[model samples]
Target chain A: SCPTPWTSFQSSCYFISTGMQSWTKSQKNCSVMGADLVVINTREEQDFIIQNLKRNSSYFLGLSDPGGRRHWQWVDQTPYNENVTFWHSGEPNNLDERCAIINFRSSEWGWNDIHCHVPQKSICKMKK
Target chain B: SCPTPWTSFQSSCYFISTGMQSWTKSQKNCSVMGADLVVINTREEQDFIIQNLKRNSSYFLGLSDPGGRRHWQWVDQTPYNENVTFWHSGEPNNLDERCAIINFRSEWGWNDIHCHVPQKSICKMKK
Candidate 1:
């Protein structure tokens, strides 16, 4: 059975955190829960989170440019594709720190780079 | 403009109930505050409520069969369309009243429940 407050999807359960925390703290929090920050792989999966999670709030992603502040990678070390990146207009400014967020400020609902220390809500995913 | 905690979309404000009240009582509360129970017009709008509000909780919508519980209608007095109704597998067997509830287990699915149980109302207001 799925944990309380965890939504079940194809062999995975997702938890949308109720509060915000720094990117590093969020990742650590997920790790502590035996999970990791959500790594979106499909539009359907993305739709589930976007529609179920708190609206109008930026959520931290497990994806980051932590390795060299240039090459983005998932905490689980999944490869990030620059060609498949879902950046909003003029994003990854490379001016901000090397963290990613699902921004609600835009109608397009794309990604943006932000400082790693900024507190933001996060989603965690784990398999049974 | 609505107050804080009120979610705005397309110049309308929606407030998902934090408490329960009877169907009649719920509508009255919204009326007293110059609003009304939410009347969903779009599947997308319903999706917004389904995904954003507290999941697995009962929230009332502005929908009920009118004309001796015959012609279902919202506060706007528009006829409820059976084509757009989102009832669960087996529902409204006249086990209760005429009001509709957004189902907890389904994705934006509506269920008819004239419950004597604790039922929360989701109110909507035009800005």
Candidate 2:
């Protein structure tokens, strides 16, 4: 069962943080709770999170190009399915911006590439 | 993620059988898939199964009285918690009916039945 403050979605549980931390630190926090940064596997899941998120806040996602190799991967070892990704237009455009986030654009929420060291709130996911 | 043919619920994967078998054989089938008969640990878990069940069929559960002595236990080693049970009124009335089932007993679903009775069953495992 999902613990207190952890929301249930499908077969998994999620915890959204109220505090900000760097991408690495955010992952660490999730690890402490036996979870990892949220892995967005489908458009339906992305839409579910968007509904729960505050419009003004950006949250760290689990996708990253580890060691700046440009080989993006999900934290749970799920292959990055480019066909289903939600990246905003022309985003993930910088080589140094390895971490990803669900950010608000002019009118919609979508994925964006950002610097790993920047602080942001994050969502953690784990088996229920 | 849970593989095909197995439905995911909460943090676990489950396989509900279409064919009926004895309770022991049903558990054997689940064991072949590296799982066991579904161990219900909470009321929500019991309710979830109820929502997915067919109105006419009963499913074998992972609960049983290991011996004729009436010591009820769960297959996964979780102690049977009487406070959260879903037994129909006057259920667990027979010591010889060792195995438990999700029988359609009016509105409440749980009942103690004979182990050799042919019934469909649900298998559960970590996802």
**Which of the numbered candidates is closest to the native, going by highest TM-score?**
2
TM-score of each prediction: 0.39, 0.40
What shift in Å separates residue A59 of candidate 2 from its native position after superposition? Answer: 0.5
lDDT (0 to 1) per candidate: 0.64, 0.70
Question: Candidate 2 DockQ category?
Answer: incorrect
lDDT of 1 by residue, B6-116 (tens): 888777888888888877778787777778887766557766776667766777666543312122222123344555432223322221244556655533455655534
User: What is chain B's TM-score across the candidates, in the order shown?
Assistant: 0.71, 0.74
Off by over 4 Å in 1: A67-97, B1-127
DockQ of 1: 0.01
Q: What is the fnat of model 2 with respect to the true interface contacts? A: 0.00
Model 1 scores a C-alpha lDDT of 0.64
- Local accuracy of candidate 1 as per-residue lDDT tens digits, A1-128: 67987888888889888788998789888888878887766667777777776557888876654422133332123344456432334333331235667755433455555677889998888767
Off by over 4 Å in 2: A68-97, B1-127
Cα deviation at B92, candidate 2, in Å, is 62
lDDT (tens digit, per residue) of candidate 2 on B6-111: 8888998888899899988998998899888887766677778778788888888776544321233332234545554323234333323356677564464555
Model-by-model DockQ, in order: 0.01, 0.01
Q: lDDT score, residue A14, model 1?
A: 90
